[PDB]
Write a protein that binds this ligand. Structure first.
Ligand code: IKC
Length: 822
């Protein structure tokens, strides 16, 4: 049946492939699209063929890339009628990414970065023919097949009790036989991620006589449930325990779906695989009658429910209070029961559907008809709201598929920064083929960035003990449907990272003197690689490295010695590529913190608030290793303070003098100090809301332009000053020892941004919830989310929330807070 599920998946993906022909350029562009985030004049320089100097001109940020292309065309051509405006595109110099014509110049992320750093905006005008499209799919790609490397009784008429005999575990290890004397299983039955009944424990039995590799229970297990009472998505969990010989110690876990991908109840012997990480086979024998049991969903209920009593005796106000509540998190039982009665009065508010669904009394087969009738007349949800319908608490195929149908309204650009949570949501689909995985694969088909990011996220997801096989099939489908070009580039990137990681290991394994000469020798391997391959940068695949710059490659001195890898651009119009490669730390936590910060930045920009945040990249390439973006011309606060100490003129001047050294002009220092004010406000809000703690001087970094950012996120969602404002940071903000209206601006910015994040409390809780199953040390349960919820204070109004955050700023000032009038 599993092989049949794989085959059905493959053939469905063949269908999906037909939906994306290689001829269609917008689905198959062959190149990365320059990212856009929706949100004056700036100077752009555009290189044009046949001109020795690029044309530099002032463009409106609001103007679209299409008309900017035409403006450059107008520079070189006095009449644009003869030339074709079509078949002309703009790329970033040095980066193999194409600006999107319909979108505004200001909306492009590269433009926004250059504006913040005051970097020269450098573009190239070229035809589609000149653009590198080596990633594009071929006719060979479209034609190739997909490779990932009798009577019937309806279930509602099925009286039999769910039962099965746990037979045996086969292939147990020597050290297992050494360490434990008996074994037993805990059997749980669940739906929507919750137990339907209390778990039943097997008897404790030792290894079978004459068969040490075998544990034989041969034990029947009967649940107090009836086949007709089992939801379609019912899952049986079997956890193995060993008792030590000298508490019980968990050895592994298995899951079995109670109905297969064709809705047939599992019957007969089914084998399951427990990975010690070594494969143990577990045998579960299910009843096998002379007939097949099929699940049949209930009969459709059709109603137009509109024209009902609106007594509204304070009850409408109670309903709106529940509707306009922040999230489903913590919703009272009584509130649940009456949101469920008055669910048909909430159609006017679509994004409250999860709450309603979370307040269903049960998912018994009978009530399913009315639930589905409501779902199919429900208004479309915001994609972001619809995420919640893909978490574990909603297993129902109808709910989830219709959530994905609402989700299909999301842009690729917005989707890309959300990909990790989707990769995780795959875990709550019990079948291989599902609307969610098809949605992800189709989005990857049409967008090279989506495909690339999915690839790396699936490679991390593989290391899951329980879900590794599912992710292996998903990754195989992705690599198969991506095409030959995409695949070979991904293989080059995989080889590059593996080589870099080897170099990292060797650098830490050597000591002192040796460590500097081993780096040059280890790197010769890499340079051989570059001799035979041009390879795209895994952190930003728009950058192509032709060759390693050995002499600029070094190592940072830290607990884990990171590698400063400098490579030369394949494009002479580009800059040299600088990344850090770190091994020995789980970068997935850092990535989550960075993603949360970035999403706050997006939320702020959506309401027009620009806190000038440094948004840098981090990629977990393999287990406990990866590439991190390097921010140029920036230091930790430690370093600034110690360098200043050599002079030691004042505790309040170290940040000021540093910024003044890199910004000598009075206008320049004011510009850099304003950058500090805004970025500091953003960092303070992000620190308090994410529970970022241990913000020591090393953790804080400051850019020469004046922007403040965070680098190490070891304390994430930690519990207990919320943030710390030292005297020299107050000096930069005020511009003087005494307080100025610039500090009031700082406070205003903090409180404004804080309230903007509170408005999106549901989004943030959902994103962290969906990362729960990924297995980071500080995000294991819903209480970890309750910390963030409490930090966001949803019940309070914006006014009292401002009061609260302002008191936080005073506590952060601490001893020097005497000098301020709130
Ligand atoms: O100057 C710098 C600042 S060091 C730095 N920065 C980071 N940034 C983001 C994330 N983590 C870090 C980071 O951990 N550290 C190390 C800080 C540390 C040092 C020594 C011991 C312990 C800790 N970085 C560089 N940038 C470039 C460059 C040039 C041109 C373009 C470009 O994109 C980058 C070359 S070197």
């Amino acid at each position: 049946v599993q092989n049949d599920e794989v085959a059905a998946f493959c053939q469905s993906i063949m269908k999906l492939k037909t939906k994306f022909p290689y001829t269609d350029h917008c689905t198959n562009p062959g190149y990365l699209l320059s990212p856009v985030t929706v949100q004056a004049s700036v100077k752009v320089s555009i290189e044009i063929e046949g001109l020795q100097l690029p044309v530099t001109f002032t463009c409106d940020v609001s103007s679209t890339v299409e008309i900017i292309i035409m403006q450059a065309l107008c520079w070189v051509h006095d009449d644009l009628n003869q030339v074709d405006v079509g078949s002309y595109i703009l790329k970033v110099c040095g980066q193999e990414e194409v600006l999107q014509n319909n979108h505004c110049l200001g909306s492009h992320e590269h433009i926004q970065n250059c504006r913040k750093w005051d970097t020269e905006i450098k573009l190239q005008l070229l035809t589609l023919s000149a653009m590198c499209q080596n990633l594009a799919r071929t006719a060979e790609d479209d034609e190739a097949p997909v490779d990932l490397n009798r009577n019937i009784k309806e279930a509602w008429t099925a009286t039999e009790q769910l039962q099965f005999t746990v037979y045996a575990a086969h292939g147990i290890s020597s050290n297992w036989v050494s360490n434990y004397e008996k074994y037993y299983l805990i059997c749980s039955l669940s739906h929507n991620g919750k137990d339907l009944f209390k778990p039943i424990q097997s008897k404790k039995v030792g290894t079978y006589k004459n068969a040490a590799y075998l544990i034989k229970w041969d034990e029947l297990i009967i649940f107090p449930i009836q086949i007709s009472q089992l939801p379609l998505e019912s899952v049986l969990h079997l956890t193995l325990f060993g008792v030590l010989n000298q508490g019980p110690e968990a050895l592994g876990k298995v899951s079995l779906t109670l109905f297969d991908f064709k809705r047939f109840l599992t019957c007969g012997t089914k084998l399951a695989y427990l990975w010690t990480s070594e494969r143990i086979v577990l045998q579960v024998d299910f009843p096998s009658p002379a007939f097949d049991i099929i699940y049949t969903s209930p009969q459709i209920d059709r109603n137009i429910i509109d024209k009902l009593e609106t007594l509204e005796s304070d009850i409408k106000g109670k309903l709106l209070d529940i509707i306009h509540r922040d999230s489903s998190f913590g919703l009272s039982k009584e509130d649940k029961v009456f949101l469920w009665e008055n669910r048909y009065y909430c159609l006017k508010h679509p994004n409250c559907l999860p709450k309603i669904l979370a307040s269903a009394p049960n998912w018994k087969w009978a009530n399913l008809a009315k639930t589905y009738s409501l779902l199919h007349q429900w208004p479309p949800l915001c994609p972001l709201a619809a995420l919640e319908l893909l978490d574990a608490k909603f297993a129902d195929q109808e709910v989830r598929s219709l959530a994905v149908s609402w989700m299909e309204a999301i842009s690729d650009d917005e989707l890309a920064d959300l990909l990790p949570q989707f990769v995780q949501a795959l875990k709550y689909e019990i079948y291989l083929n599902s609307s969610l995985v098809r949605f992800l694969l189709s989005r990857a088909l049409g967008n090279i960035q989506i495909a690339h990011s999915l690839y790396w996220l699936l490679k991390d997801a593989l290391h899951d003990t329980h879900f590794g096989s599912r992710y292996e099939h998903v990754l195989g489908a992705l690599l198969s449907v991506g095409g030959k070009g995409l695949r070979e580039e991904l293989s080059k990137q995989m080889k590059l990272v593996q080589l870099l990681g080897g170099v990292a290991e060797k650098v830490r394994q050597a000591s002192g003197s040796t460590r500097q000469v081993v780096l040059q020798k280890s790197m010769e391997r890499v340079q051989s690689f570059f001799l035979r391959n041009k390879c795209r940068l895994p952190l930003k695949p728009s950058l192509v490295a032709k060759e390693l710059n050995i002499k600029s490659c070094s190592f940072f001195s830290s607990n884990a010695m990171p590698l400063k890898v400098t490579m030369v651009n394949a494009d002479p119009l580009g800059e040299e590529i600088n990344v850090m490669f770190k091994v020995g730390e789980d970068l997935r936590q850092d990535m989550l913190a960075l993603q949360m910060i970035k999403i706050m930045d997006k939320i702020w920009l959506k309401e027009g608030l620009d806190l000038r945040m440094v948004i840098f990249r981090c990629l977990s390439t393999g287990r406990d290793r990866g590439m991190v973006e390097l921010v140029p011309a920036s230091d930790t606060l430690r370093k600034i303070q110690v360098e200043y100490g050599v002079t030691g003129s004042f505790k309040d001047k170290p940040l000021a003098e540093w910024l003044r050294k890199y910004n000598p002009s009075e206008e320049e220092y004011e510009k850099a100090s304003e950058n500090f004010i805004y970025s500091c406000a953003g960092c303070c809000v992000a620190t308090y809301v994410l529970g970022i703690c241990d913000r020591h001087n090393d953790n804080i970094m400051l850019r020469s332009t004046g922007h403040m950012f965070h680098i190490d996120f070891g304390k994430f969602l930690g519990h207990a000053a919320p943030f710390v404002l030292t005297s020299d940071m107050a000096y930069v903000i005020n511009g003087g020892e005494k307080p100025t209206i610039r500090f009031q601006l700082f406070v205003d910015l903090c409180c404004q941004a804080y309230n903007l994040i509170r408005k999106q409390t549901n989004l943030f809780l959902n994103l962290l919830s969906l990362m729960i199953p990924s297995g980071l040390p500080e995000l294991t349960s819903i209480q970890d989310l309750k910390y963030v919820r409490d930090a966001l204070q949803p019940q309070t109004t914006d006014a009292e929330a401002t009061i609260f955050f302002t008191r936080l700023i005073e506590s952060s000032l601490g001893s020097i807070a005497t000098k301020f009038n709130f």
